Amino acid sequence: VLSEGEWQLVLHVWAKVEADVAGHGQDILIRLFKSHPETLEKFDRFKHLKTEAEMKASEDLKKHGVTVLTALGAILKKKGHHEAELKPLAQSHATKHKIPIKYLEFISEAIIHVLHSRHPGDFGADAQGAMNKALELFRKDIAAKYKELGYQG
Ligand SMILES: [C-]#N
């Protein structure tokens, strides 16, 4: 459960993300691809991307970073009442992308790392703890929908 004050922490850092969604999105996906290169074979769209250099210059990668952060931001802003906003995301990742839950733990770690590098004055122990809890509720809810489809992974 996040306390209301922990949701406020999440939302306060989020507003920082929002002032530069494309830069945050690039950092996050690159971080993910560098830390868990196997996840990159799950994105059809990025098969031409090899070097870090290539990732940084990619428009496909930047535009996707925006799409990912827009969808997640809409979910975080709901403070746990996100069934509507999460359902479409869950079902597509299950059916169309076949993304194991594990991948969701990887991109969570990436987001946490990036927030910390970028907004350290805002991203202390208290904020990291609340974000961790928000992302873990997000995964748990995703895993519930996967279940309903019979989608393992
Ligand atoms: C889609 N990350």
From Swiss-Prot:
Globin domain boundaries: 1-147
Residues given in the record as nitrite binding sites: H64
The encoding gene: MB
Pfam families: Globin
Protein name: Myoglobin
UniProt keyword Amino-acid biosynthesis, yes or no: no
Keyword Amino-acid biosynthesis among UniProt keywords: no
Binding site for heme b: H93
